[PDB]
Ligand SMILES: *[C@@H]1O[C@H](CO)[C@@H](O)[C@H](O)[C@H]1NC(C)=O
């Protein structure tokens with residue numbers, strides 16, 4: 001074979017960073033094979049908004065965008081077009097007319113530590129709602145009070161980020177879930193990627 | 196930019212941080228209870244200290260937002276919970292001496308032991324030996340000796356400490372916005388800001404008074420019957436017109452009359468329903484007991500249990516080298532962790548206890564969506580009330596026959612039902628006048644109505660007038676009888692049990708009407724009724740977000756606690772009591788006393 005699509009790398013990455021700064025992976029010019037994707041673990045949530053999973057092979061895409069992050073179980077429902085919620089409006093907002101597949105599978109067996117995995121963080125205080133497909137990594141003292149924060153925290157001045165504490169004893173609904181959102185873009189230029 | 200907007204973000208941050216800190220405190224507690232070691236003790240102490248420090252810091256932070264500027268009626272409740280001022284508003288030395296008094300009282304009650312005079316051969320503690328003697332022994336002299344010995348051992352030591360305690364708690368309440376510590380405790384039922392559903396602190400007194408005035412006839416007939424049976428037992432120590440003596444009630448205090456069932460059972464030929472031998476002969480164990488309870492809670496409409504619950508919960512005692520507390524308890528560790536700690540054995544009592552604990556866990560699951568400060572029962576009584584309603588529903592002969600523990604060829608008669616109702620009466624009705632009397636006396640002592648030189652005199656006069664119980668040996672002001680009870684010694688609210696007793700029967704009446712039941716209320720099974728489960732879930736999902744008046748409206752259609760459910764429950768036993776006591780003087784006179 002000439003090429004392969006790095007689908008085995010977007011998954012099986014052993015680390016998904018966080019969702020406040022979601023990893024953005026751009027894939028192009030490769031042979032698209034979804035056998036490994038379907039051969040990975042059974043998926044808690046696999047919803048495709050644009051194309052049927054089989055007809056994905058019939059349609060050729062120049063640009064494929066992959067976004068990988070870890071969120072709680074109940075926050076998966078927030079990652080959907082037209083959803084209102086903390087994660088949806090402050091961490092990662094899909095567009096209203098999003099065309100892509102949202103793939104989620106449990107990561108409690110690997111990414112949960114008894115002491116508490118505080119590496120993964122999410123944002124819970126932002127000045128306004130995020131525009132679709134945006135990544136905001138700026139972390140300065142939130143100014144909730146009408147008095148100037150003067151660069152410090154405490155009274156009416158908080159930090160924009162709060163981490164999840166993931167432990168294996170947690171029940172479903174707060175266990176860490178690995179979500180890899182695939183985004184497809186079509187623009188008027190020669191694609192030259194098919195099979 | 197406003198008070199409300201500022202308060203919202205602070206509440207969100209506090210809820211998120213408190214979730215994790217409460218989870219580590221609860222996990223430390225669970226580890227210590229399951230497996231007691233020095234490392235676990237240190238971990239639990241550290242987690243508790245961290246949680247207390249966080250609560251104090253956030254409470255001091257939250258006082259900035261005035262409660263007149265908040266108009267959501269939910270943020271207001273969360274801020275009231277935060278600003279409840281659990282951290283002492285009094286001085287440092289005053290807080291230290293209050294803690295000293297509480298610790299001394301708890302230590303005295305826990306380590307209280309009684310020996311023979313000038314004889315160290317035997318020294319009995321309260322729970323192991325003294326409670327056993329009170330429960331089983333039939334000797335009038337021994338019972339009087341044990342009662343007087345406990346009172347002389349504990350009350351003489353605890354009287355001045357309790358006087359200092361009442362003074363200090365009144366000072367603390369005056370330092371806060373409440374009047375007395377009785378007002379502080381009554382504030383748990385206070386609901387303000389919601390027109391058409393409000394509850395006032397002063398309304399609880401009137402509601403409890405009216406409820407007891409309604410209960411009075413049934414309790415009077417029960418007292419007459421028990422007095423007649425105890426006259427048959429002890430020939431001359433009980434007067435046909437006199438009040439029942441205290442030490443003969445069954446337990447050290449008279450809170451429960453269940454120990455009198457063996458002496459005062461109406462019909463002894465037909466035994467009460469027992470399923471232990473049947474469970475052994477059908478080869479049942481604790482795991483399948485909990486599985487059957489899960490099936491019942493599914494059938495009523497409540498959700499199934501968690502795989503994590505099944506994996507982490509220890510429903511059997513490990514034994515051997517491992518030592519753990521065996522008091523049944525349902526743990527809501529938080530963030531989806533629900534567990535039960537119960538040394539379950541193959542008994543009908545353990546089956547009912549498992550149903551009670553799974554009712555607890557189902558309530559905890561129901562209020563899981565609400566914020567941390569609201570993740571509780573609407574008041575102090577609904578949580579145990581929900582446990583108890585499932586306990587009564589799962590004990591019916593119909594349910595036992597359906598599950599198969601009893602032989603389906605069996606049929607029930609009048610004597611069995613009367614005996615079961617009388618046992619439940621001694622368990623339930625008996626504790627109501629005692630709870631009412633104790634709470635009234637404690638409220639009056641807090642309010643200062645009862646002077647120090649007349650504390651015990653008024654206590655015994657009110658007990659004689661209300662509960663119809665008189666002390667064997669008269670006690671002057673030196674003794675402090677109420678301090679003997681664990682709740683009074685450790686300063687726990689005690690009207691919770693009265694409220695729960697009314698609430699469980701109201702819930703049962705509502706759910707039985709929902710489940711399309713025809714017949715007397717005691718033989719009510721809600722096994723396969725899906726409508727009753729949803730009608731209960733309408734309250735279970737709320738938590739503390741809505742007032743308890745609105746929750747009670749959602750369940751039973753009434754905004755106030757009612758005792759007619761209890762009266763309708765005990766109607767057949769009341770008919771039996773009317774038949775039995777037709778020749779007996781119902782009531783009691785205050786003049787008679789054991790001492791002459
Ligand atoms: C504040 O009021 C809104 C009503 O729009 C409600 O949705 C929200 O839950 C309230 N706040 C809290 C903390 O419940």
Ligand SMILES: *[C@@H]1O[C@H](CO)[C@@H](O)[C@H](O)[C@H]1NC(C)=O
Nearest residue numbers: 258278279280284370371372
């Ligand atoms: C709690 O105590 C602080 C101590 O400074 C006081 O300012 C505040 O008013 C108190 N709050 C209540 C509700 O009593």
Ligand SMILES: *[C@@H]1O[C@H](CO)[C@@H](O)[C@H](O)[C@H]1NC(C)=O
Nearest residue numbers: 489493498499500501502503
């Ligand atoms: C979930 O409930 C169904 C019945 O509603 C039951 O068969 C199943 O065992 C439950 N799941 C777990 C993990 O107990």
Ligand SMILES: *[C@@H]1O[C@H](CO)[C@@H](O)[C@H](O)[C@H]1NC(C)=O
Nearest residue numbers: 230231232234235516517518
């Ligand atoms: C209790 O926990 C400790 C530490 O986790 C462990 O070594 C021990 O085996 C457990 N059980 C007992 C009975 O100590």
Ligand SMILES: *[C@@H]1O[C@H](CO)[C@@H](O)[C@H](O)[C@H]1NC(C)=O
Nearest residue numbers: 607608609610611613771774
């Ligand atoms: C009903 O109960 C009474 C108890 O006084 C008993 O005498 C009577 O025989 C019972 N009825 C039947 C049909 O057993």
Ligand SMILES: *[C@@H]1O[C@H](CO)[C@@H](O)[C@H](O)[C@H]1NC(C)=O
Nearest residue numbers: 494593594597598720722723
């Ligand atoms: C309740 O439903 C179960 C499951 O179908 C059934 O076995 C049982 O007999 C039902 N209860 C009664 C009283 O029939």
Ligand SMILES: [Zn+2]
Nearest residue numbers: 551578579582
């Ligand atoms: Zn309970």
